[PDB]
Amino acid sequence: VYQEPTDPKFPQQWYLSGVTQRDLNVKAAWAQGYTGHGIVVSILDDGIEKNHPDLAGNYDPGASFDVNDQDPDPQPRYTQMNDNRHGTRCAGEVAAVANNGVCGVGVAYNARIGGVRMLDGEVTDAVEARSLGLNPNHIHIYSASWGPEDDGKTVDGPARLAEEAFFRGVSQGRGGLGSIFVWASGNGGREHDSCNCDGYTNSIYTLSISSATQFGNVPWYSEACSSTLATTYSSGNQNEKQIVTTDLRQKCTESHTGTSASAPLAAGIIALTLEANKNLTWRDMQHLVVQTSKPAHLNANDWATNGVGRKVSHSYGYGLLDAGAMVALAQNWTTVAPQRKCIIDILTEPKDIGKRLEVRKTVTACLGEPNHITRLEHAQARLTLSYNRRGDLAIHLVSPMGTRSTLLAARPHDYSADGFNDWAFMTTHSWDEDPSGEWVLEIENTSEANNYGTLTKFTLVLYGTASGSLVP
């Protein structure tokens, strides 16, 4: 019989297990025998306290580096306000040691854990690339709780070196199975930010993770968008409990919060899943997340059923991660076929936007060709357009099976006149649908002002396979 941990703060880790069903079902995976043994996770952040009493026994120097000062030791820089505590808190969520009389436990408490010190300095494109491409035949899973500013007016993503690091990672990393990149979807909720305006979360190569409060609500800081894949618990109001983890100066904290705490919990659950099947590819892992995540009792006003009968939301993706279900489904999972890519250039001429524009196009999805796709994964609408006030635009895309994805909601603070320059808006909401048929793009002015502009390019990019489907 499995014996649950005895650590002094484990009873306060409400999100790991309980009778209530408001948890991530992690104890069920522990009882099947999976605790993370043999898996390696790296925290890309402001450093890691490698001598912390709840981290030292799992610390792995092969998963660590200091990019800011160019040395191998990722120890954080100590200051009066404890500014560099962020990475240490994230690491303890993944892999804090169990049954040692100290603080609580990680999701994957027997996994090996490291850190890249890269936020404590100027974060250039080169700095990101060296961190994402660190030791890719040793590190399995990378976790990033940072990104572009959440002011609700920025449009920004990885530059050339960073994007090259993503493609190298998923292609040649982990022995050719592909690095696993986990991302926090953002903290811009109060600014009405959209996580599709962030190229790191919007990327097909990252698993973008949102947050739910203890009582099952959308937190104040949460950003909605179509590129989010799934959700884990984090903080909410002051009557709701928070996240328990390792803190700077060898302390324990019960008040870790925000989008920053959701991605490390997902990285831990992915570590358990990899232990149950080491042969899973980067795309396999996203299939497992789509099939096993749980919507039940997450409150939102936009829940919709897609073409294959799955519930999906722009606040939550496919819902809460389920650790016990992930490791069960992983054990006899059959590897997916190689990824195909079908490119469809939609427009024959530019179109004025005006008050409202609708573009309809029937596609065959590369019928007759080696990249024919009948089973969709990610879809992108790559748009080039000019407009006088960018944040007044709302953009929607409808798939042939009837699924409406919000590519862009209104952003009140976005006054830019710079438009979008081939920006690849991404949606996960049509996963496993047949993409043959009519697609519809809608662009509208949500304000009463007399705005003007022109849509000059619309490329629909489809990714997926032509085999292996399951009954909806």
Binding site: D45, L119, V123, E128, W146, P148, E149, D150
Partner: peptide
């Protein structure tokens, strides 16, 4: 003044 934020 920062390109990337925690």
């Amino acid at each position: 003044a920062r390109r990337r934020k925690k």
